[PDB]
Amino acid sequence: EIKDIREDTMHAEFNALRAQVAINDGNPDEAERLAKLALEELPPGWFYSRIVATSVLGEVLHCKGELTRSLALMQQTEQMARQHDVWHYALWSLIQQSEILFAQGFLQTAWETQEKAFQLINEQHLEQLPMHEFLVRIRAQLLWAWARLDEAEASARSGIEVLSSYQPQQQLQCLAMLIQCSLARGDLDNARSQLNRLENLLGNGKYHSDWISNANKVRVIYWQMTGDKAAAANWLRHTAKPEFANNHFLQGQWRNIARAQILLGEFEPAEIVLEELNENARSLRLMSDLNRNLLLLNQLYWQAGRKSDAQRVLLDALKLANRTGFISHFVIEGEAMAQQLRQLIQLNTLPELEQHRAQRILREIN
Amino acid sequence: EIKDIREDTMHAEFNALRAQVAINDGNPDEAERLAKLALEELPPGWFYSRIVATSVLGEVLHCKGELTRSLALMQQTEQMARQHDVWHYALWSLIQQSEILFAQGFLQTAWETQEKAFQLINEQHLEQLPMHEFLVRIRAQLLWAWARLDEAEASARSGIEVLSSYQPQQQLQCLAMLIQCSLARGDLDNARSQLNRLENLLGNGKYHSDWISNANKVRVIYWQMTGDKAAAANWLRHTAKPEFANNHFLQGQWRNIARAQILLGEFEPAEIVLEELNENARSLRLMSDLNRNLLLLNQLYWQAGRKSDAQRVLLDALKLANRTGFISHFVIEGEAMAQQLRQLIQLNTLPELEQHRAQRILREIN
């Protein structure tokens, strides 16, 4: 166990990269163990592995839901990366920072953070690089929330162009975003055509669970919009159902499950799912998740004929949107949402902000 | 060299399948050698390998341009396959028969042959099977020639659906057909969007030369329609230029080369190419190739300002279309074609049939 100190330090660098692969493979505990072991043995000078290990710990804390500490580590990573011209880690850091901000419902701050990433890309000529697609994809997500659909679509298409030299499977998420735009527009013909491509890609690759849940998100919304109970039921029977267990990274997949359950009239289990997701969202101040969940609860109560409950949560959702800025999440609920909003607007009792958003949404829908 | 006769016959069956793989790999001489060796040693009873070897010889003769004899072998193959319920070889035979008929300019007969294939598919419940895509693709090609674009597009989309479970690369040819439809409609926005997908597929697979030439066919037409000399020149510099050498299977790629040359003002070499292709087309009575080549010659003369030559070959092309039934091949030539046809129609000297087709084409273009 005696070697040149050089070899010991090189082994520590290997540990940092082993940690990076571990978190990528969905093994945060091993990633944390390895990243810590690396940092304990990396002296000044061996800057690259230190950037990687610090970045990995940021990802680990993000996974754990320790968002404030995660952001601090992402910031540390960004600064070190900039200091050493390690542009890919500086850009990856900014992308992750936006992700947390968006989840917290701070969309303007997320936009500004994405803007810093675009600035970095422009300054260092990083346009043709793959990570550029991730940035335009999250920019599209934000534009979509704000109902700037033409811009969101253009952002998603720029992502597809960035990855034009890679296998078609790499476009899965930007394609899902294109479909998400078609769904918000009520352009079901285009959504269906795009979904044909999405489903073909899904059947031709082994993807990360989060990619699959994102793709399934738009498939389930399309099935809801077309009353495709058969497709939703078959999907639900075979989809992954990892125990939620207060894991915020599983909010998306469980919303897909709840949406399918609601479409199928399985109101009881869906309400239990959504209440559990909301406990988690409130505990971590994930206002975006909360806003999405309240809209699904509204759909559940509405379809179940529970008028009072439906109205109560719709008012909560509209109020919460004063902070999240969400518009399109309401729009995809179509006629059911339009009827409810027309009713609220006609009563003349909504506060000015909510009244204005209700009117905007009703316009997007009509 | 003494073995159970059973082993000798099994080796003969292997030779038949080795011949099938050889022709698929573009080695007709070896395929012919092996298929003949197999048939010489296959007794009655060993029907499957005999169907394969006979089918292979049909493909070999097709390659050699001995179309009449090739059709006879395809017919023999179809009958034997039907006799033994070997549906895939009966369907493959009918597809090949149509291919020859279409090349000969007998489009109605090709349609009828395709119809027999659809009948077989319906009777034997072969709808979900992969070969169904090849049939709907050649049906789309025929519908496209006749300018039944909505039908052609639907046929191509049914092909894409048939292959939905396979890798996206398998849809290359039906996607090229969708683009071909968009080009005939003058719907360049959709053509460009579809071409983005086509080019991504082209950069992500090792394909047969004929698949590549078919995909490039629509890319070059799009570049011509958008005046993209840069793209055409780069493509031309790097594309395959196998010596034509009186090989009718190379008509398509050389037309792509000539079309690019014409767009780039390289009239002299393009005229030499087209004249050589026409010698081959006339020698084998390939009226469809002749009709396509005459239209490219028309474009060449027109762009070169050789009015008399342009008119002469356009009149020849219109006359030939009385037999081929081609419409869309004229339509994709757009404004240049429209101007020329308006001039011909206004002179009031065209025979009734050609006048009627000229008017139809001018309508498709406007």
The answer to whether A94 and A117 are in contact (CB under 8 A) is yes
Q: Which amino acid belongs to residue B273?
A: V
Query: For residue B77, which of B65, B68, B89, B66 has the smallest C-alpha distance?
Result: B89
**Specified resolution (Å):** 1.5
The answer to whether B283 and B290 are in contact (CB under 8 A) is no
The residues, any chain, with a CB within 8 Å of residue B267's CB and separated by 6 or more, are B261, B300, B303, B304
Q: Which helix (H) or strand (E) holds B274?
A: helix B267-283
Instruction: Give the residue from chain A lying closest to B203, CA to CA.
Output: A165
Q: How many residues would you count in chain B?
A: 366
Structure-derived torsion over alpha carbons of residues A311, A312, A315, A319, reported in degrees to the nearest 10 = -170
Other residues' Cβ atoms within 10 Å of the Cβ of residue B188: 14
The answer to whether B165 and B129 are in contact (CB under 8 A) is no
Q: Which of A160, A161, A168 sits opposite B201 (nearest CB)?
A: A168
Distance (Å, whole) CA B77 – CA B96? 11
Q: Do B204 and A166 touch (CB under 8 A)?
A: yes
How determined?
X-ray
Q: Do A204 and B168 touch (CB under 8 A)?
A: yes
Structure-derived torsion over alpha carbons of residues A232, A237, A240, A241, reported in degrees to the nearest 10 = 100
The answer to whether B94 and B78 are in contact (CB under 8 A) is yes
Structure-derived torsion over alpha carbons of residues A68, A71, A76, A78, reported in degrees to the nearest 10 = -170
Query: For residue B88, which of B136, B134, B22, B156 has the smallest C-alpha distance?
Result: B134
Question: What's the alpha-carbon Rg for chain A, to the nearest Å?
Answer: 22
- For B1-366, which CATH superfamily applies? Tetratricopeptide repeat domain (1.25.40.10)
Residue A2: phi, psi to the nearest 5? -110, 125
- How far does the CA of residue B167 sit from the closest CA of chain A (Å)? 6
Q: What string of DSSP letters covers B175-238?
A: HHHHHHHHHHHT-HHHHHHHHHHHHHHHTTS---HHHHHHHHHHHHHHHHHTT-HHHHHHHHHH
Question: What is the CA angle A236-A238-A242, rounded to 5?
Answer: 85
Distance (Å, whole) CA B124 – CA B290? 37
Cβ-based contacts of B168 with chain A (< 8 Å): 168-169, 197, 200-201, 204
Cβ-based contacts of A203 with chain B (< 8 Å): 164-165
- How far does the CA of residue A327 sit from the closest CA of chain B (Å)? 28
The answer to whether A120 and A87 are in contact (CB under 8 A) is yes
What are A206-215's contacts with CB under 8 Å, separation 24+? A207/A169, A207/A172, A208/A26, A209/A26, A209/A240, A209/A242, A209/A253, A210/A249, A210/A252, A211/A172, A211/A173, A212/A240, A213/A252, A213/A253, A213/A256, A214/A172, A214/A173, A214/A176, A214/A252, A215/A172, A215/A173, A215/A176
Q: What is the DSSP letter of B156?
A: H
Distance (Å, whole) CA A187 – CA A179? 9
Distance (Å, whole) CA B23 – CA B30? 8
The answer to whether A274 and A293 are in contact (CB under 8 A) is yes
Exposed, middle or buried, A131 (CB in 10 Å: 0-12/13-18/19+)?
Answer: middle
Q: Do B200 and A168 touch (CB under 8 A)?
A: yes
Residue ranges of the domains in chain B?
1-366
The answer to whether B326 and B364 are in contact (CB under 8 A) is no
Q: Do B166 and A204 touch (CB under 8 A)?
A: yes
Distance (Å, whole) CA A184 – CA A327? 10
Helix-, strand-, coil-residue percentages of chain B, each rounded to 5: 80, 0, 20
The residues, any chain, with a CB within 8 Å of residue B347's CB and separated by 6 or more, are none
Which of B167, B171, B206 is the best substitution to test chain A (most A C-beta atoms within 10 A)?
B167
- How far does the CA of residue A190 sit from the closest CA of chain B (Å)? 12
Please tell me if residue A199 touches chain B, with a CB cutoff of 8 Å.
Answer: yes
Distance (Å, whole) CA A326 – CA A295? 11
The answer to whether B114 and B151 are in contact (CB under 8 A) is no
The residues, any chain, with a CB within 8 Å of residue A265's CB and separated by 6 or more, are A303
Other residues' Cβ atoms within 10 Å of the Cβ of residue B40: 10
Residue A161: phi, psi to the nearest 5? -65, -45
Query: For residue A198, which of A252, A143, A156 has the smallest C-alpha distance?
Result: A156
Number of helices (H) and strands (E) in chain B: give both, helices first.
Answer: 19, 0
Q: What is the DSSP letter of B250?
A: G
Please tell me if residue A276 touches chain B, with a CB cutoff of 8 Å.
Answer: no
